[PDB]
């Protein structure tokens, strides 16, 4: 609760790397808890925990995407304190995620069904913390995608800056400007269209 | 050579006289009293002969004569003249056989910084390092000697001479030593040069080298380093080197040998590369996978 | 190395037996009154022991030994030897703590002045002036030291050394926004360098900086000032500095912030600027 | 400031103490006949008082004390110490009264050239000439002083120093004095640098100055001299100055001031004038009739 010093480590397994969860030892925490990681007075980042037997006590393991988003280095000292969400205000009703192929060698023009994307995303990341601008890697039909959180909205229509994704959250995807991505189906915004005609 | 032949002939004659003077010395320490003056005359002739050897082209004999004269002179409760002869003895030994020049210099270093003077001691330190690197095949002792010279210089406020000494040692270390030190000294000298109007126009080169040193380890923190540099130094964005880095890192992310090779060749077309940077670029390329 | 620090402890014992040498002054010189040379060798062991610390990289201890040796040696005799010890102590004190080095150097300045050796004293005045700049933040004291050093140099016709010292003073004064002093120094040097062939190429920079300083206080007088420079030196116009200024002043007649910005960027496009110039332009052009 | 007021107050006290010291010294010489320690110590008091007085920002009386101390010291058959005080006294007077400074400096020069040091004596000659011309408006004595200085440097093969002063002497002589001396000095110095280590491509300007001086004399001498340099020094054929002078030469032949005016205008636009060529060119244009 008060916070303790910990050493940053590397993620132990590929499976835990895709979970976007900070991996800890059972002797220190319990799976599902949320912590706030402090690297400086102006840098506080929230992560969800998942225990693994291989983590040495006194250390927290992070995946490469987390270290890049979090500006963390292996072996660096960090301060970790338990974080409790106010579920009345911090449950997510809608998030906007910018998605692109993680590895350029594996780019293809095949369609990807966003409706199946959203269901898999919820199944994988339910009850886990997310923040605006967070970066993570997301696997779908054995294909790796790079994700970037763009916007977050509260559960029932109050706007919020940060929240918790839950099972019944509804996600809408909008293609980034200058994107040739072809999106089909629901789970999008599909904004209006400013015609060339003048009044 | 007739001039050298007669020069060597009289040189031998002075040696015989000097051999008679050491006989005078031993006869005046155990047989007579007050020989300090007599051996002082022996030292004068020893210096008289020793130097004339240096004009006879017989460097090895001259160095031996200087060392013998100095060591004898140390016994007379006098130290400054001991230092001068030690330095002269070394100056003769720099060529031919320099191994004993190191030992005598260290003794001269010991005496000088057993007297009160730094700038001469540190100047001899860098001289020892230069001779060590040029003719002895070993670099680690050079790092230590440059570090010791750096400590003496910067302490005495002779920042200008220190800066180059710190720069050279850090640059050489990057070749065969972990790059953490290279980053530290390069960043330190770059920041110090920033405020000063002298190196402010050239600090970009130091920033360029620091980025190359950081890039060779990993890519992600290198992006952090470069963005931090341009944040602190806004005028680094327009530098052609910054554009070169951005193209290089972007190409490397794509894993394309052709684009990286042509970009470095394009940079090489204008100006010229160096023995060091070419090796650095090749080393990073070899691990592209 | 490590054992030389072992002999450093023995060198503290050498100071300790020097303590017995002053213990002779306590009781034993009554019968050794003629041992004034004994005090001299006592100072000699001080000196070599003083620097066996200066071997071990013990900056404080070496400075303490130098100051103590100087104090003992300055028995109203061999003053120059005491002065050499004092400056050596200041040089040693430069690293770590330079505060006491100022006092010792000031004492050496008084002795050297009393002897009348200007060049060494003024050079030391520069040394104390630069250490103030690079270690402390006071600048007014540095200005005073530079002025005194310049006056000493100017007495002995060392014009060039005094010239550069005054140039640094003018820049600091300009940064301290006292423009009358800056313009006078810049004008004096500018018209003096042109007097001799060896330095006639340098003045263009001096006149440009002086014009900017004039250009800060009274814009209206700037046009007259630049005209005076142009007529005084017929070779002042074509130089890019004069054309650039003429454009800046004429552009300011109309309120067009754009006009001047491309001009300074265009000038910067041929060579980079310095903190002094960029800072002054940023401040002055704001209004 | 308290420092100033106290320094002046103790300055007068020391001066009064010295004055009573010397009068008592005269009394004691007959009274006790202690030798000469009384006078020398009084000189030390004079030196201390003078040297502290100058620190007090007051100059005129400081040099006066120096001169008195030097005069008394020289009374005891010591020359070099008094002469050094003369140099110190003269330098102090430099900002107080030029005439006294000049007199004392000349006294120092004659005694120094009496001792036998010419570099110091000639160095003082430059200083005398520099003060003579910088503030006092006159040339002839400056020319004599510099010419004497140039002779002394050449007395000890200080070619670079003699070259500079002779060039300086020739330049002013051309400005005001006749041209024959300028011709010889400029031609001799220029031709004596054809094989310069680093000044190889600098001797060109020297011949250019000579060409203008000959042109100022007469047209026929101008062309004849211009050719003589062409054959003598091949590289001068392709110098930009050679084309300019040829263009000016032919332009002035036909009496078309417009061609001359545009020819000088283009030269000024391409590269800047020097404030010395412009005056000569204007004088040339004054006699186009």
From Swiss-Prot, chain A:
Residue(s) carrying N6-acetyllysine: 105
Compartment list: Cytoplasm
Residues the record lists as Phosphoserine modifications: 195
Lineage: superkingdom: Eukaryota
Function, as annotated: Required for vesicle-mediated transport. Catalyzes the fusion of transport vesicles within the Golgi cisternae. Is also required for transport from the endoplasmic reticulum to the Golgi stack. Seems to function as a fusion protein required for the delivery of cargo proteins to all compartments of the Golgi stack independent of vesicle origin. Interaction with AMPAR subunit GRIA2 leads to influence GRIA2 membrane cycling.
Subunit structure: Homohexamer. Interacts with GABARAP and GABARAPL2. Interacts with GRIA2. Interacts with PLK2, leading to disrupt the interaction with GRIA2. Interacts with MUSK; may regulate MUSK endocytosis and activity. Interacts with CDK16.
Family as reported in the entry's similarity comment: Belongs to the AAA ATPase family.
The protein's name: Vesicle-fusing ATPase
Name of encoding gene: NSF
Portion of the full-length sequence here: 1 to 211 of 744
Swiss-Prot record, chains B, D:
Keyword annotations of the record: Acetylation, Cell membrane, ER-Golgi transport, Membrane, Phosphoprotein, Protein transport, Transport
Highest taxon, organism lineage: Eukaryota
Residues making up the signal peptide according to the UniProt record: none
Molecular functions per Gene Ontology: protein-containing complex binding; SNARE binding; soluble NSF attachment protein activity; syntaxin binding
Subcellular location: Cell membrane
N-acetylmethionine, modified sites: 2
SUPFAM superfamilies for the chain: TPR-like
Major location category of this protein: membrane
Positions of modified residues (Phosphoserine): 27, 30, 196
Topology with respect to the bilayer: Peripheral membrane protein
GO biological process: apical protein localization; brain development; intracellular protein transport; membrane fusion; neuron differentiation; positive regulation of ATP-dependent activity; protein-containing complex disassembly; regulation of synaptic vesicle priming
GO cellular component: glutamatergic synapse; neuromuscular junction; postsynapse; presynapse; presynaptic active zone membrane; synaptobrevin 2-SNAP-25-syntaxin-1a complex; terminal bouton
Subunit details: Interacts with PRKCABP, and disrupts the interaction between GRIA2 and PRKCABP, leading to the internalization of GRIA2. Found in a complex with VAMP8. Component of a SNARE-like complex that contains at least ZW10, USE1L, RINT1, STX18 and NAPA/SNAP-alpha. Interacts with VTI1A. Interacts with STX12. Interacts with GNA12 (via N-terminus); the interaction promotes CDH5 localization to plasma membrane.
Stated role: Required for vesicular transport between the endoplasmic reticulum and the Golgi apparatus. Together with GNA12 promotes CDH5 localization to plasma membrane.
Family the UniProt entry places it in: Belongs to the SNAP family.
Protein name in UniProt: Alpha-soluble NSF attachment protein
Source organism: Rattus norvegicus
Lineage: Eukaryota, Metazoa, Chordata, Craniata, Vertebrata
Gene this protein is translated from: Napa
């Amino acid at each position: 609760m008060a916070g303790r010093s910990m050493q940053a480590a590397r993620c132990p397994t590929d499976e835990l790397s895709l979970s976007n969860c900070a991996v800890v030892s059972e002797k220190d925490y319990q799976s599902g808890q949320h912590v706030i990681v402090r690297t400086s007075p102006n840098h506080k980042y929230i992560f969800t925990l998942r225990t693994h037997p291989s983590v040495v006590p006194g250390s927290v393991a992070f995946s490469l995407p987390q270290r890049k988003w979090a500006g963390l280095s292996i072996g660096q000292e960090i301060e970790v304190a338990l974080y409790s969400f106010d579920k009345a205000k911090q449950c997510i009703g809608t998030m906007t995620i910018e998605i692109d192929f993680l590895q350029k060698k594996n780019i293809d023009s095949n369609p990807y069904d966003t409706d199946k994307m959203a269901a898999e995303f919820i199944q994988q990341f339910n009850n886990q913390a997310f923040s605006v601008g967070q970066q993570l890697v997301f696997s779908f039909n054995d294909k790796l995608f790079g994700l970037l959180v763009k916007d977050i909205e509260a559960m029932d229509r109050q706007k919020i800056e940060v929240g918790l994704v839950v099972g019944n959250s509804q996600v809408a995807f909008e293609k980034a400007e200058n994107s040739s991505l072809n999106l089909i189906g629901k789970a999008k915004t599909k904004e209006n269209r400013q015609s060339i005609i003048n009044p | 050579g007739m001039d050298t032949s007669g020069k060597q002939a009289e040189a031998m004659a002075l040696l015989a006289e000097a051999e008679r003077k050491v006989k005078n010395s031993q006869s005046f320490f155990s047989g007579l009293f007050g020989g300090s003056s007599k051996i002082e005359e022996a030292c004068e002739i020893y210096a008289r002969a020793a130097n004339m050897f240096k004009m006879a082209k017989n460097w090895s004999a001259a160095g031996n004569a200087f060392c013998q004269a100095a060591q004898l002179h140390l016994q007379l409760q006098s130290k400054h003249d001991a230092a001068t002869c030690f330095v002269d003895a070394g100056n003769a030994f720099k060529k031919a056989d320099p191994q004993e020049a190191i030992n005598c210099l260290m003794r001269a270093i010991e005496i000088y910084t057993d007297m009160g003077r730094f700038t001469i001691a540190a100047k001899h330190h860098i001289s020892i390092a230069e001779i060590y690197e040029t003719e002895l095949v070993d670099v680690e002792k050079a790092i230590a000697h440059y570090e010791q010279s750096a400590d003496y210089y910067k302490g005495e406020e002779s920042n200008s001479s220190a800066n180059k000494c710190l720069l050279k040692v850090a640059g050489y270390a990057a070749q065969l030593e972990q790059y953490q030190k290279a980053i530290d000294i390069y960043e330190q000298v770059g920041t110090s040069a920033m405020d000063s109007p002298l190196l402010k126009y050239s600090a970009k080169d130091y920033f360029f080298k620091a980025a190359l040193c950081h890039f060779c380890i990993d890519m992600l923190n290198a992006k952090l380093a470069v963005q931090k540099y341009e944040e602190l130094f806004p005028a680094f964005s327009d530098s052609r080197e910054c554009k070169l880095m951005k193209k290089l890192l972007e190409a490397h992310e794509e894993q394309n040998v052709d684009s990286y090779t042509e970009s470095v060749k394009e940079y090489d077309s204008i100006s010229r590369l160096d023995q060091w940077l070419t090796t650095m670029l090749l080393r990073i390329k070899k691990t592209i996978q």
